[PDB]
Each structure stands twice: as structure tokens, then as C-alpha cells.
């Protein structure tokens, strides 16, 4: 109980320090920025072939190959340019909540309620996709999954921890600690030196994969965090909550920077992604349509209406040439 | 023409499309059952062409993923679960030891299995009629 007083004496000190740098707000600093204007995008391609809800999706670094996982227990590697199917990987358990496509394109990972992250080998002999490894060690639903360039995978499970594995050996080499709830979101850095995880505590922490220390910790949300993504330069990130309030934080300022709220939506947010230049902040709400926000004005710039169910996944290619979304209607659509 | 190898690639895509449909038929001819009250445990048993797939399970975040299951089984709070915007349109089966069904367990295994099989049928009937423009 003695340490409780010290913790209170520390949290208030941190709160006061953050307020010291609070000299203005982005909504007032960039009032002279010309609005981007109405942005209209048409569904160029409509990939179909899934027979259940689509829970995850990831873009290959080449910006052409697209993976997707659904409740059918089948990953599909799409060719976005021609809508062709490159692979169809069957899964041992049809409970998948995430997927990742390796930066080099050799491997693809997935996982879910089985508490197992399976690494599949795409480019191999005999033209057959087989489970290269079966990572185990978590104690809860595997929430998110991302590949580091060195073929070492970072996972975030429902046991309130995030681990860094070694595909070659198959055992954890690091472990987040500090979250007080299920970790639902995870986002690497462009340089892969840092990453952030959002949990069911209205808190988003920052981690270092090199030595394993919690650098910052951002609060301000009122409910769980269901998605996170970095600004292209890697000095800021945006998170999506269940109270329909996307918030943009800054790493160097250690304080919330801007908020994107619209009372017309009362349902939560299920995906957040930035554009190549970082001016656009796409968001996938549960109202069955996306909302292409403005990263600097908090004013809507369009909507990607055209989904019959909620938008559960949302990703933007590396070159920014397209946007893909996958709703529970079992349909992926490439916008632009 | 406009395609040289893409014709071969398109042929491969059409072969994958078929495999999804053929295996997609098996999923349609199946009923998923969730039991409430490491990993996930699954129990598969056939019953007159119904390959019943009965599987058993912060804690409120696991309900979005299980939505769509045919029914929920209780073996023994129930009011709150029924009005969570997820299982509102899902039947609940309760064993003693949205059309809520209650049955007293019996020593014979066939009788218990018979009751649950019937409970799945009618809920399937209701879905069919609702999808047939009748109710």
C-alpha cells in the first residue's frame, strides 16, 4: 500500500509535465491549410471467393499480392491487379483473427483462437504451401501478428502480452509486460525499431524490440482500442476505439495531439490506416462504410460506401496506389 | 491475344475456385454449436448426415467472433447474454442435471442427442421460412 502513494505522486507529476508542452493544438495550428476537398474513390476490383466473414488482410510489400483470412479456415493469396488466386492455404482450425504477409514475400503467418501462430512457406520446392513452423507459448487468443524484416515475428495475444519470436528456432526471445487487458492491436514501425500495442484498457503503449523496455504510455480513450497504425514518418500514430473516436498521438510529445469524432456514428471503429503522404486517415467503422478522414483538419473528405456489412480489415499499399477493405460479407474490394 | 502466361495462371485460379466451392459445400451441410457455462477444444460426431461440430470455449470480446453459430448450449446471467446484440437471433438450449429450450437429462445418451437434434432442426426451419419471404 505504501507504493500506492508513490505511484500517485508519480502519475500526477507525469501528467503535469505533459501539460507543460501543451502550448497549442493542431486544429488551431493548421487552420490555414487548404482542405483537400471532396475525395471520391470507386471500387476498381472486387475480389470474391470467400464463404464467410473476412477477419484480416495484409498487403505484400510489392503492392500487388494480397492475403486474406476468413472463418472458412482458408487463407487466399490474391493477385489484386487481375483478381486471380495465387494460393489457397487450408487451416487446421477455422478460428483466425489475424494474418500477415512477410515483407520478402516468402512466408505468410496467421493465428487466432487456437493460441497458435502458424508460419506458412509460400516459395518452396514442389509448389505446395506447408506449415514451416507452429509457434506456441501464448495463453490466449492471438490478436495481431506482424513480420519483422529479419524473419522474426512479433505477436500480441489475449493474455495481455506481446512476444517476439524466432522462426528459425521457435521460442520466444522477448515479452511485453504492463498491459492490464487483452491486447487487440499492434503496429510495427517503418524502420522496425519500435512498435505500439493497444489493449482493452484504453491505453496504447510503446515498446522497443532491441532491449525490451516500455518507452511511453498514452491514454485518453474511454473503451477498448481495436486498431492502430503509424504515421508514415514513424513519429506519430492513430488509434481506433469502441467509442467512435480516432485519436492521433505523437511519440516525441508524449501527449494526445488530435481527435477525429463524429456524433453521427455511435458504433466503434475496427480499422485505422494512413495514406502514403499521411494526409488521409482512413477508418473502418461498424456502420458498414469507411470514413476517409483528414489527418490535419478532422473533417470528413469522403466515404467508401459499398460494403453490405461492417469493415473488419483495411490496408493501404506501400506505394499508396490503392486501398483494400474486407467486410463480414465475405468480399474484398480494392478502392482507389 | 492479350494473355500469354496469364491464360495458364487464370486456369489455375479457376481450379482453386472449384476447390473452394466443393469444400464450401461441406461447411453449408453442417451445424456449429457453442457451449457456454490451452486453446479451443472441438468434438466432432456424426448424426444421420449431420456432422455435428460441438466446440467449447475482456471475456466480452469473444462474442463477436462466435456470432452466427446455430445455437448455444448450457449445461447446469442467461438473460444478459440473450440481449447483447450478437446472440439475439440465436436459439439457446439448456440441459438440466430466440426459442429457449429446456430438457431434463436422462441416463440414455440417445434420448439426449435426439432432443438436441430436433432443436437444431426447427431453428433451421425458422431460418428457412424467414428467408423464403413467409415470415
Amino acid at each position, epitope marked *: 500500500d505504501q507504493l500506492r502513494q508513490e505511484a500517485e505522486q508519480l502519475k500526477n507529476q507525469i501528467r503535469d509535465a505533459r501539460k507543460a508542452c501543451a502550448d497549442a493544438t493542431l486544429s488551431q495550428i493548421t487552420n490555414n491549410i487548404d482542405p483537400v476537398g471532396r475525395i471520391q474513390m470507386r471500387t476498381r476490383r472486387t475480389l470474391r471467393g470467400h464463404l464467410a466473414k473476412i477477419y484480416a488482410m495484409h498487403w505484400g510489400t510489392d503492392s500487388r499480392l494480397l492475403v486474406s483470412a476468413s472463418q472458412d479456415g482458408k487463407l487466399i493469396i490474391w*493477385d489484386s491487379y487481375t483478381t486471380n488466386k*495465387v494460393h489457397a492455404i487450408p487451416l487446421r482450425s477455422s478460428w483466425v483473427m489475424t494474418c500477415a504477409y512477410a515483407p520478402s514475400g516468402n512466408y505468410v503467418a496467421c493465428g487466432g483462437l487456437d493460441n497458435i501462430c502458424s508460419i506458412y512457406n509460400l516459395k518452396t*520446392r514442389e*509448389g505446395n504451401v506447408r506449415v514451416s513452423r507452429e509457434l506456441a507459448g501464448h495463453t490466449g487468443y492471438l490478436s495481431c501478428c506482424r513480420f519483422l524484416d529479419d524473419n522474426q515475428i512479433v505477436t500480441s495475444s489475449g493474455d495481455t502480452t506481446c512476444a517476439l519470436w524466432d522462426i528459425e528456432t521457435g521460442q520466444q526471445t522477448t515479452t511485453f509486460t504492463g498491459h492490464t487487458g487483452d491486447v487487440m492491436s499492434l503496429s510495427l514501425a517503418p524502420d522496425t525499431r519500435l512498435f505500439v500495442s493497444g489493449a482493452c484498457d484504453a491505453s496504447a503503449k510503446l515498446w522497443d524490440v532491441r532491449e525490451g523496455m516500455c518507452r511511453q504510455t498514452f491514454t485518453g480513450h474511454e473503451s477498448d482500442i481495436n486498431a492502430i497504425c503509424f504515421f508514415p514518418n514513424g513519429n506519430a500514430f492513430a488509434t481506433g476505439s469502441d467509442d467512435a473516436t480516432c485519436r492521433l498521438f505523437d511519440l516525441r510529445a508524449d501527449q494526445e495531439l488530435m481527435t477525429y469524432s463524429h456524433d453521427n456514428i455511435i458504433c466503434g471503429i475496427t480499422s485505422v490506416s494512413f495514406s502514403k503522404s499521411g494526409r488521409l486517415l482512413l477508418a473502418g467503422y461498424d456502420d458498414f462504410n469507411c470514413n476517409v478522414w483528414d489527418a490535419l483538419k478532422a473533417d470528413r473528405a469522403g466515404v467508401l460506401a459499398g460494403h453490405d456489412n461492417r469493415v473488419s480489415c483495411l490496408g493501404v499499399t506501400d506505394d499508396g496506389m490503392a486501398v483494400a477493405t474486407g467486410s463480414w460479407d465475405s468480399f474484398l474490394k480494392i478502392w482507389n | 491475344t492479350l494473355s*500469354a*502466361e496469364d491464360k495458364a*495462371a487464370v*486456369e*489455375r485460379s479457376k481450379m482453386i475456385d472449384r476447390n473452394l466451392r466443393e469444400d464450401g459445400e461441406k461447411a453449408a451441410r453442417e451445424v456449429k454449436l457453442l457451449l457456454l457455462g490451452t486453446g479451443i477444444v472441438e468434438t466432432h460426431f456424426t448424426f444421420k448426415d449431420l456432422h455435428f461440430k460441438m466446440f467449447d470455449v475482456e471475456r466480452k470480446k469473444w462474442i463477436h467472433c462466435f456470432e452466427g453459430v446455430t445455437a448455444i448450449i448450457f449445461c447446469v446471467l442467461f438473460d444478459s447474454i440473450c440481449n447483447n446484440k450478437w446472440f439475439t437471433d440465436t436459439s439457446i438450449i439448456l440441459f438440466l442435471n430466440k426459442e429457449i429450450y429446456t430438457h431434463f437429462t436422462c441416463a440414455t445418451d440417445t434420448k439426449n442427442v435426439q432432443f438436441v437434434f430436433d432443436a437444431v432442426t426447427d431453428v433451421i426451419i425458422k431460418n428457412n421460412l424467414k428467408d423464403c419471404g413467409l415470415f
Partner: single-chain antibody
Amino acid sequence: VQLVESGGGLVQPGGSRKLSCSASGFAFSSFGMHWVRQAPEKGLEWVAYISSGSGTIYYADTVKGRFTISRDDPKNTLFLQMTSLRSEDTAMYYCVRSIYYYGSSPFDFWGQGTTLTVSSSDIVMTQATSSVPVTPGESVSISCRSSKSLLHSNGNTYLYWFLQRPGQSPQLLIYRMSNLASGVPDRFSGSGSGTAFTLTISRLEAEDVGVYYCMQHLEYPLTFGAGTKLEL
């Protein structure tokens, strides 16, 4: 992974013969299959092709009608029913696999070969070169020419470079512009555009001696080059 075929031997001209290839170590049902003959002293020549799942079949003009190709996935066997043999049908027959999807490497693995002996216009590719004497350690460049432009509207230049070491089936080196095959040293490099193509070898080693063939996959029938050869 082996692709071994059996059959061959002397056959009365005008008769029929059956050539079978047994595939083990890889998923046969998911691969396309090609037949390529090689006359004793002329070079490689395309024969026939059967897609994955017997979707489509293509035959060379010189052997259209009297040749049939069949595929039996459950037993992993490829059959070439040969009918009305003639003097020029004699050749060393190879069985080649090729999987077609975005980013794949078709013609990667070649069979071993069965020797078949018979007792007594649209796309042309030329290699204006012959046996080039070369010593180890010096770079070598091999030229190639195409009647048509192999570049396509989608940006893929369908040229494949094969190497046939003495006494062994040809091995894939490069399948497109600078697209090295698996298990090939970095020394080899590919380049060129349009109808002009070149293959460069850096720090040539002893094992690199052989015959280099150029093939186009832009449109059937597939046609090989003159097979430039290297002398140590």
C-alpha cells in the same frame, strides 16, 4: 524430388509406342507438364503440353494429330502415346514440369530422359554463335535474337535461359529479365530488351561449360534457339 521416365528403344518406323514418366517427391496434380525432344545433333524442340487438371492441351505442328498426351494424377504418371513414327521422330525425350502463377518459375525441373530410336513459320529464335573457346576466370556474354518482340503489354519479357551440361538434362538458369532461378550462382545475369537479349557469366568456373539454350514463352508453340556452346 525426381522426375524419371522409362521406355524408348528401337521401334519399327510407322508403328506406335508409349512413353511414361513417373513423378515422385512433389505434388504432381498441381503442376503443368511439358514434353521436349532433342534430336541427336540438332537441339531442343517442343513436343506437347498438358495443363494442370488436363484443362488444355497443345501440340507442336510437326507432331499434331498422331501424338497424344495423358495425365493420371492419382498415380502420378505422365503418358505420351506415340503413333505413326517416322525417321525424324528419333530423339532424346525429356519430361519437364512448369507451374504457372504470378511470380512462379516454370520449366524449373527437367526429367532425366528416355532414348527413342526409329530404324531407317510463326516465331523463330536464332543464336548467331557457335562453340566459343573460353578459359576459366574471364567473363562471357551470349547473344540471342528473336523474330518478334518478346515484351508484353503487362511488362513481362518471356525469355528463358537453359544450360545443358554434358550428359545431363538442361537446367533452368534465368526465366525472365534478370530473374535468377533457385540454386543458381549469382554469377549468371540476364538483360536485354525487345528482340535483343544477352546472358552474362561473371567469373566463369569449370562446371559452367556446356550448351546454353534460349526459349520464348510468349506464345505456343515454344521454340528454342540454336544452342550456343562453350569450350574450355
